[PDB]
Amino acid sequence: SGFRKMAFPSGKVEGCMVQVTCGTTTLNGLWLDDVVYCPRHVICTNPNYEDLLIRKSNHNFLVQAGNVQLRVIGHSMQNCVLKLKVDTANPKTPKYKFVRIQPGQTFSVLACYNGSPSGVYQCAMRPNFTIKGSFLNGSCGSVGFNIDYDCVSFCYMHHMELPTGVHAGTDLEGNFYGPFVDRQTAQAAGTDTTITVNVLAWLYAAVINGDRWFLNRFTTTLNDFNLVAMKYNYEPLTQDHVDILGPLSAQTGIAVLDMCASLKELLQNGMNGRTILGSALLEDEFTPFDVVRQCSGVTFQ
Amino acid sequence: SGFRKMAFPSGKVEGCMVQVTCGTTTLNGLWLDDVVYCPRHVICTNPNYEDLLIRKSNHNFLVQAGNVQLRVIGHSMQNCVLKLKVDTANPKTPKYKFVRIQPGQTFSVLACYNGSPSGVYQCAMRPNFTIKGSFLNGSCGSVGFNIDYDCVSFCYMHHMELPTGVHAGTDLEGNFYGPFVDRQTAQAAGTDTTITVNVLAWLYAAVINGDRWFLNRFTTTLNDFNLVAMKYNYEPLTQDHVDILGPLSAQTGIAVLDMCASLKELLQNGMNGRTILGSALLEDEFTPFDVVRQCSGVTFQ
């Protein structure tokens, strides 16, 4: 029992973090097989990165894997990431994939400075393709990831902080999440919404943990819920969302649309000083998979 | 910027987790050098563990380090933990210590099933020596820890869930935190309090991140604060607590006792629907060290 913002064990990823230096810029890189991936705004000198990259040569890139120096034998650009071919394959390379996530999905972040891991936290890709992260200067290049049995699914690389303090970055092929670019502009985050299907999974997690003050006798159709959802800046609930919540509806015996009627009442009335799972807010950064994982027993390695 | 419940990178500890089996009991063990530590209620058959331990022999303990089996050549009891001497020293043994923490201090938990790590989360030792953890059957033997540069300070081993859903366990010498025992009794948690010095460190973290709606013109002496603290079930604030908050008081230019006057007002009025650092509750599971670490840039390895 208990319910915590849980992150995946981070060892498999710690073994791939390196430090990349060129010019007077230093940031973190990801070392898989004989490639080191890192953000491309590490290269020298309003930009035009194909121009600046033909100006450098391999020997400008200092790559530090611990004490050991790594010899850069080739380079290339993939969208907003740089791939530095080195002459050594990382012996600690785990089985891995590069996958792009959808807003609403969660991942773990291994925040890093100078290639040294600092901390690990869980977070979600906001509906406006930002993440509410925790990052200080030099955290560029830190990656986000999920783990599925033994396989590391890399989904995010950190690039920049936005005016409001949220963060933006790319998948591992270098394509940004959201309408952001790796140059100085006036870019800001769009207006965000609350991830409805996640709030309902969290409500199921509370029920599974003995909080029940918020359920109700009522029910509702999908249409009349979404009428109330839109009013409070909540994402729309789809029939597929109802399907994904199915297993959690079964485990507890509360029908998905009954839980919705309960969320309706919560949105309309507030909480009256009570808390759910130790929170006085409705939490939207747990998916249905996250809840099933933390209340059934699933491990990895 | 941003502020997250951050846990230490867990790789160094993942390399020490093993599975321990005897009888029909299976739980997790910690493998350092040529010893495996695990809870003693793994042994066979209201107890009397010195009795039951003279009944077993080495060959009853099945120790699995991945696929590799580990050969138990000796055993002994240290308070509520068991030490199983094996014939192999763990090559992945990090530099480490065993240290006992004080209520109010934080650590990271690597939750484990069958020796396989499942997740990592941050938490605090409640003033009543329980922790609000997240654990399912088979998580016995999971450890908590801090990391200081390269050194792993092991402070907790998980043993049992209490009636209210909180958790209890021991340090690594086998001495329990709190008045709990590893046998079936009616034991319950004492009444808890809120960790005042941590709430103030969290308020500084909000200020450092641009939340300032809650400060105030007022001030207060230590005595008149504690008069209000005790009323709301808050720990007493000591002169030493004021000292530890010093650096954070300097960085922001808010005097420690000014921040107290602000907490006084928050306790007396509530929050009026506003939030601090994304929370509608006052958070007490960040220490002054935690805040300085997450808003200055300190790494490990």
The answer to whether residue B140 is catalytic is yes
Tokens representing residue B28 in the block: 């997790």
Fill in the amino acid letter for B135: F
Instruction: Give the three-state DSSP class for B94.
Output: coil
Question: Can you tell me the distance from the alpha carbon of B19 to that of B29, in angstroms, rounded to the nearest whole number?
Answer: 6
- Sign of torsion, CA A300 A3 B82 B90? positive
Give the closest-approach CA distance of B269 to chain A in angstroms.
13
Shortest CB distance from B119 goes to which of A9, A281, A295? A9
- Asked if B160 and B167 touch (Cβ cutoff 8 Å), the reply is yes
Chain B residues with CB under 8 Å of A11 CB are 9-12, 14-15, 117
Shortest CB distance from A10 goes to which of B11, B113, B118? B11
Which domains does chain B possess? Answer: 1-14+95-192 (2.40.10.10), 15-94 (2.40.10.10), 193-296 (1.10.1840.10)
Question: Can you tell me the distance from the alpha carbon of A172 to that of B100, in angstroms, rounded to the nearest whole number?
Answer: 41
- Asked if B27 and B43 touch (Cβ cutoff 8 Å), the reply is no
Give the closest-approach CA distance of B106 to chain A in angstroms.
14
Task: Return the half-sphere exposure (C-beta side, CA atoms, 13 A cut-off) of residue B282.
Answer: 26
- Asked if A168 and A126 touch (Cβ cutoff 8 Å), the reply is no
Contact state of A136 with B297 under an 8 Å Cβ cutoff: yes
Contact state of B298 with A112 under an 8 Å Cβ cutoff: no
Long-range contacts of B230-239 (CB under 8 A, 24+ apart): B231/B267, B232/B194, B232/B267, B233/B193, B233/B194, B234/B193, B234/B194, B234/B196, B234/B199, B234/B267, B235/B104, B235/B127, B235/B193, B235/B194, B235/B195, B235/B196, B235/B197, B236/B196, B237/B196, B237/B197, B237/B200
Beta strands A72-78; A81-86: pairing state: antiparallel
Shortest CB distance from B10 goes to which of A1, A9, A134? A9
- Sign of torsion, CA A30 A36 A37 A42? positive
φ, ψ (nearest 5 deg) of residue A82: -110, 140
Question: Can you tell me the distance from the alpha carbon of B185 to that of A64, in angstroms, rounded to the nearest whole number?
Answer: 55
Shortest CB distance from B116 goes to which of A135, A278, A299? A299
| Region class of A165: left (phi > 0), else alpha (psi between -120 and 50), else beta | left
What is the helix (H) or strand (E) element at residue A262, kind and residue range? Answer: helix A256-269
- Asked if B49 and B64 touch (Cβ cutoff 8 Å), the reply is no
- Residue A64: closest CA among A19, A127, A118: A19
- Asked if A71 and A61 touch (Cβ cutoff 8 Å), the reply is no
Contact state of B118 with A12 under an 8 Å Cβ cutoff: no
User: Residues of A128-147 as b/e, b for ≥16 C-beta within 10 angstroms?
Assistant: bbbbbbbbbebbbbbbbbbb
Resolution of the experimental model in angstroms, please? 2.5
**Residue of chain A with shortest Cα separation from B118:** A299
- Chain A, chain B: beta-carbon pairs less than 8 Å apart: 151
Chain A residues with CB under 8 Å of B209 CB are 165
The answer to whether residue B44 is catalytic is no
Question: Can you tell me the distance from the alpha carbon of B159 to that of A198, in angstroms, rounded to the nearest whole number?
Answer: 31
